[PDB]
């Protein structure tokens, strides 16, 4: 088979959005004093395997 | 209000330097068989929020 659409009541888009939540772990690698960072803590969904 | 200075008996600069070490980990990213890496384990303090 070869699917193209997923239908997903948005009670379950929020479950798929919660799997990424358990695996995010923000990390800072570029730091030499200047430009104190600033955070957002939000993200969107681009699909599953395209 | 808004502050401009911090005064810090330099024992506590060494404590503020010590709280960085429980929140850092050196990590390596490239793998090509050249330039065996060089370590330093030292880091300077640039203040707090600028």
Please tell me the distance in Å from B46's CA to the nearest CA on chain A: 6
Distance between CA atoms of residues A22 and A26, nearest Å: 11
Chains A & B: contacts with CB separation below 8 Å: 4
Backbone phi and psi for residue A2, each to the nearest 5 degrees, phi listed first: -155, 100
* DSSP state letter for B35: S
Helix residue ranges, H only, B4-49: 10-21
Experimentally, how was this structure solved?
Answer: cryo-EM
Query: Across B1-50, where does the E strand assignment appear?
Result: none
* Chain B residues within 8 A of A33 when measuring between CB atoms: 46-47
* DSSP state letter for A10: H
The terminus-to-terminus CA distance of chain B in angstroms comes to 17
Q: Which residues contact B3 (CB under 8 A, 6 or more apart)?
A: none
């Amino acid at each position: 088979g070869a699917y193209d659409l997923i239908l997903t009541t948005p009670k379950v888009v929020e479950q798929y959005k919660k799997v990424f939540e358990a695996n995010r772990s923000y990390q800072i690698m570029t730091f030499d004093g200047q430009r104190v960072p600033l955070i957002d803590l939000g993200f969107n969904v681009a699909g599953y395997m395209g």
